[PDB]
Amino acid sequence: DKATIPSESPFAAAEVADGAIVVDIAKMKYETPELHVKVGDTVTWINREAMGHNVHFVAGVLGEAALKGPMMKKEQAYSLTFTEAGTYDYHCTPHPFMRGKVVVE
Ligand SMILES: [Cu+2]
């Protein structure tokens, strides 16, 4: 896979890891819709809003399978550790007008 999943469950915003690269979700948007990171980095999405959101990568992007992340409640978080250079587009499953990308290089 081009990413590993530290936790299949969301977890509390306060539990975000030192060194994680944070993307806030607020105002029905990924607040950093184009993020550039290094191989080995952990990206953590944190939902800052009442409405639930996830991150969803279709099949062939992070590996063979689609990665449909868990729904994050307000002040919940979810991480992916990127292990290979590339450009990885994602969207929010319930809100597909929410689009983002992670560029690993
Ligand atoms: Cu959403």
- Residues with Cβ within 8 Å of residue 3, at least 6 apart in sequence: 62, 63, 67, 80, 81, 82, 83, 88
CATH number at residue 85: 2.60.40.420
- Token pair for 12: 């509390």
Experimental method of this PDB entry: X-ray
Residue 94 belongs to what H/E stretch?
none
Ion ligand 1 residue ranges (Cβ < 5 Å):
53, 92, 95, 98
- Domain of 5 in residue numbering reads as 1-105
Cited resolution, angstroms:
1.2
Residue 80 belongs to what H/E stretch?
strand 76-82
Q: Are 99 and 90 in contact (CB under 8 A)?
A: yes
- How far apart are the C-alpha atoms of 90 and 13, rounded to whole Å? 21
For every residue of 5-71, which 3-state class applies, written as one string? Answer: CCCCCCEEHHHCCCCCEEEEEECCEECCCEEEECCCCEEEEEECCCCCECCEECCCCCCCCCEECCC
Nearest to 39 by CA among 1, 84, 79: 84
φ, ψ dihedrals at 76, nearest 5°: -105, 160
Ligand 1 centre to CA of 25 (Å) is: 8
- Token pair for 65: 């399978």
Is 72 annotated as ligand-binding? no
- How far apart are the C-alpha atoms of 12 and 65, rounded to whole Å? 26
Ligand 1 centre to CA of 31 (Å) is: 12
Instruction: Count structural domains, the chain.
Output: 1
Ligand 1 centre to CA of 49 (Å) is: 10
